[PDB]
């Protein structure tokens, strides 16, 4: 009967995947420890971003209907470069209960990276209307109908920066890049010591055609903590259009190599998410007359 516990652990995977088709990755090492949350919260700080996600993921096998598990999983899985694999987790976090303002902000961001304007505005609105102090041409409705209630929320409570972050996200999705930067600048004035907004400042400068500004913000972000491969990807993108391809490729590869640092590196099914990052390697490495290398770019194993 040595198999007895392996059997049930296998069932827990598919028994919960059916109700939520999040592709829980096979070959996960935390799935047989007793207190994965306690070490996952520590792994998030001291060590690589990419191997705390598996611990938060293993929590959901032992414990469904725990909101913190999906909150953390959906947040960290998008601090890495897997956005499409984070949306479906925050949706379940909402399904547990809609009142959490810490989930709506992650939806507000994660949809702009895929141009889902309708979902972005829906979640951005409900974020504000969940708190008990905000009571009651891109689009002649549905847009200014939101921005006008944000302009009703700044004559009071002037200086909480998570509100300026929402204004930044709103102006980013409508291509107002030349005034999103100051919103994120004010936010960064008010709390300086977190990377999560330095990244969003740099990303707006990059789109405003100021790539010589962005690199400083990314070197703040990648100094508050390492392992934040989002900003490494953004640095590669900034170098590409500064025409320094020989350096852009070597930023890309230290992004791709760090994303998958675990023993028994990978299982299956999640790899479709990484297949969006190799295309920026190919796009640069198919300048500079590189023959016989775009073929491996098509499979694996780096350089």
């Amino acid at each position: 009967e040595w198999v007895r516990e392996y059997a049930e652990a296998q069932e827990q995977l598919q028994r919960v995947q059916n109700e939520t088709n999040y592709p829980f990755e096979p070959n996960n090492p935390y799935m047989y420890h007793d207190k994965p949350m306690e070490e996952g919260i520590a792994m998030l700080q001291l060590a690589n971003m990419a191997e705390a996600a598996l611990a938060f993921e293993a929590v959901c096998q032992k414990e469904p209907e725990n909101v913190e598990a999906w909150r953390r999983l959906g947040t960290t899985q998008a601090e890495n470069e897997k956005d499409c694999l984070a949306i479906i987790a925050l949706n379940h976090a909402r399904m547990l209960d809609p009142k959490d303002i810490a989930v709506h902000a992650a939806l507000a961001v994660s949809h702009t990276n895929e141009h889902n304007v309708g979902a972005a505005l829906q979640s951005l609105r409900s974020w504000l209307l969940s708190q008990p102090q905000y009571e009651h041409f891109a689009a002649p409705s549905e847009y200014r109908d939101c921005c006008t209630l944000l302009y009703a929320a700044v004559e009071m409570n002037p200086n909480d920066p998570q509100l300026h972050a929402s204004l930044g996200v709103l102006h980013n999705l409508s291509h107002r890049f030349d005034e999103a930067a100051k919103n994120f600048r004010r936010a960064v004035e008010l709390r300086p010591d977190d990377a999560h907004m330095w990244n969003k400042l740099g990303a707006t400068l990059a789109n405003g055609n100021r790539p010589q500004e962005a690199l400083e913000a990314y070197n703040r972000a990648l100094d508050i903590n390492p392992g934040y491969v989002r900003v490494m990807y953004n640095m590669a993108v900034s170098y590409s259009n500064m025409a320094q391809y020989p350096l852009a490729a070597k930023h890309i590869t230290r992004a791709i190599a760090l994303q998958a640092g675990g023993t028994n590196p990978q299982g299956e099914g999640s790899r479709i998410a990484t297949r969006g990052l190799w295309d920026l390697l190919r796009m640069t490495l198919n300048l500079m007359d590189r023959s016989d290398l775009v073929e491996a770019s098509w499979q694996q194993d780096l350089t």
């Binding site: 470069e81 956005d83 961001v109 702009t112 990276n113 895929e114 141009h115 304007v117 309708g118 996200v169 980013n172 291509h175 990244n199 969003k200 990303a203 707006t204 990059a206 789109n207 055609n209 989002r230 990807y233 953004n234 993108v237 900034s238 590409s240 259009n241 025409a243 295309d279 920026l280 796009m283 640069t284 300048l287």
Partner: protein, 316 residues
């Protein structure tokens, strides 16, 4: 028979282009129309015409834009030519590039062998983007991707004709790119006596600033839409006739040079046939002034190719 699809048919350019295509297409052919808003009304309007032998078809897109729209995945079955004309009515490039990538990705996945005609501006940058998108899924064919630049040829012919009147030529060669400084009219290659240099360079300058002339007249509220529709329909009819075997014309288009010029993309004369481009022709002799103009134009064209082929969006 042929099946021709217009992607973005309810816009200002799109419905005039569709009206012109309806009355010119050969007997026994299909016309397909797509847009995210207004397609059903345009399809109902056009189907009341008494054109015999023509069947009109349509598909309505998702009201809030959605990538890989299922409606466009079903209208794209069996199509022979795709006319891509959707666009916003570097801020313009940043959005038109993203529109074009998804449109071509959705269309090319179900009918890989079709011809693609790019009308969305700026063509100098949006033709390389389509080439890269087709390379990514492994179905790129260099003989079936075309950029439309007939409008400046029409302008050049019109401007030279009413200076030498009565002396009429049917066309004028134009090479280089498709915007302002990058377009070079070769007036030395047309028959008959020619004006003096001071007048001729004034005529040459007007051709490449003609886009601003229309917008200034409209008080900045719009651009030229009838001329673009005329040029697009005229270019599309050549491709349709050449595919069927009823002609083999010579045209000037923004195409891949296939190693015959140092610039990866350029406007050049070509011969069309039953399976795309059949022959690429050299530019031919030119004078020193025109040689200097071409030297100036190619440097900007290369900078535009680089901007097109390195496009990527930054993850917030």
């Amino acid at each position: 028979m042929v099946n021709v699809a217009v992607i973005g048919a309810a816009g200002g350019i799109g419905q005039s282009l569709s009206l012109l295509l309806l009355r010119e297409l050969p007997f026994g052919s299909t016309l397909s129309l797509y847009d995210v808003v207004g397609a059903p009304g345009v399809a109902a309007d056009l189907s009341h015409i008494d054109r015999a032998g023509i069947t009109v078809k349509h598909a309505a897109g998702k009201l809030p834009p959605v990538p890989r729209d299922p409606a466009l995945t079903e209208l794209a079955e069996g199509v022979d030519v795709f006319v891509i004309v959707a666009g916003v009515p570097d801020d313009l490039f940043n959005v038109n590039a993203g529109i074009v990538m998804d449109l071509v990705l959705t269309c090319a996945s179900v009918s890989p062998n079709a011809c693609f005609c790019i009308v969305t501006n700026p063509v100098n940058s949006t033709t390389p983007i389509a080439a890269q998108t087709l390379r990514k899924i492994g179905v790129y064919n260099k003989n079936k991707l075309l950029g439309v630049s007939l409008l400046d040829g029409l302008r050049a012919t019109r401007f030279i004709n009413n200076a030498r009147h009565p002396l009429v030529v049917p066309y004028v060669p134009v090479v280089g790119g498709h915007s302002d400084v990058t377009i070079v009219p070769l007036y030395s290659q047309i028959p008959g006596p020619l004006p003096d240099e001071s007048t001729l360079k004034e005529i040459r300058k007007r051709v490449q600033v003609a886009g601003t002339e229309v917008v200034k007249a409209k008080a900045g509220r719009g651009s030229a839409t009838l001329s673009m529709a005329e040029a697009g329909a005229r270019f599309t009819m050549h491709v349709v006739k050449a595919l069927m075997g009823l002609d083999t014309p010579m045209v000037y288009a923004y195409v891949d040079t296939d190693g015959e010029h140092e610039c990866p993309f350029l406007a050049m004369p070509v011969v069309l046939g039953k399976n795309g481009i059949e022959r690429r022709l050299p530019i031919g002799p030119i004078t020193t002034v025109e040689k200097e103009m071409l030297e100036e134009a190619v440097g900007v064209v290369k900078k535009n190719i680089a901007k097109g082929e390195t496009f990527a969006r930054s993850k917030l």
